[PDB]
Amino acid sequence: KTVVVTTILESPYVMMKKNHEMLEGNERYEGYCVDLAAEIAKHCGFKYKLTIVGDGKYGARDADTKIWNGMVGELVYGKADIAIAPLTITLVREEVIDFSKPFMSLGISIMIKKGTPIESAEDLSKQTEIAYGTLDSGSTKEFFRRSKIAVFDKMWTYMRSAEPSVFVRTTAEGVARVRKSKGKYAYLLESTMNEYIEQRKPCDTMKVGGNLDSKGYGIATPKGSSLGNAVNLAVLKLNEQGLLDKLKNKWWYDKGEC
Amino acid sequence: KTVVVTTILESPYVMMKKNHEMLEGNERYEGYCVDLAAEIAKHCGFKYKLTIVGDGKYGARDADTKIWNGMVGELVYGKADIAIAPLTITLVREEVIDFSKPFMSLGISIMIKKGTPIESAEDLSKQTEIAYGTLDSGSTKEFFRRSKIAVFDKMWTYMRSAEPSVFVRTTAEGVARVRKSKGKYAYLLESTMNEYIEQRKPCDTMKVGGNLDSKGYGIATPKGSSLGNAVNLAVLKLNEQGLLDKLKNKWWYDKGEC
Ligand SMILES: N[C@@H](Cn1cc(Br)c(=O)[nH]c1=O)C(=O)O
Ligand SMILES: N[C@@H](Cn1cc(Br)c(=O)[nH]c1=O)C(=O)O
Ligand SMILES: [Zn+2]
Ligand SMILES: [Zn+2]
Ligand SMILES: [Zn+2]
Question: Residue positions of the PTM Phosphoserine (chains A, B)?
Answer without folding.
Answer: 147, 181
